[PDB]
Amino acid sequence: GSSGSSGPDFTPQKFKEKTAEQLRVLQASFLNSSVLTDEELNRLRAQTKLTRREIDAWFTEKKKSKALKEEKMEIDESNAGSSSGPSSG
């Protein structure tokens, strides 16, 4: 018939342990793109030196954090800039 079991089924597990270095990254990324992509995922996989599952899982939970009515926000829209460049002859 069939081999047999070939090992049990993988079990879930939370990841509540990160280093300021790793976080400083994930946080700096997740912000720009709340949703993780196959691309961004890789980059972080090397930066945070963590697993693809860990990173992704993190980005998710984070979202929830936002759900909470964050403190007063700043309406002041990011200021813009300009440039010049005269001529002569």
Swiss-Prot record:
The top of its lineage is: Eukaryota, Metazoa, Chordata, Craniata, Vertebrata
Q: Where is this cross-link: Glycyl lysine isopeptide (Lys-Gly) (interchain with G-Cter in SUMO2)?
A: K72
Which protein are we looking at? Zinc fingers and homeoboxes protein 1
Q: Which residues bind DNA?
A: 12-73
Domain of life the protein comes from: Eukaryota
- Which protein family is it in? Belongs to the ZHX family.
Q: Report the protein's function.
A: Acts as a transcriptional repressor. Increases DNMT3B-mediated repressive transcriptional activity when DNMT3B is tethered to DNA. May link molecule between DNMT3B and other co-repressor proteins.
Quaternary context: Forms homodimers. Heterodimer (via HD1 domain) with ZHX2 (via HD1 domain). Also forms a heterodimer with ZHX3 which is a prerequisite for repressor activity. Interacts with ATF7IP and NFYA. Interacts (via homeobox domains) with DNMT3B (via PWWP domain).
Q: In which tissues is it expressed?
A: Ubiquitously expressed. Expressed in podocytes.
Q: Where in the cell is it found?
A: Nucleus
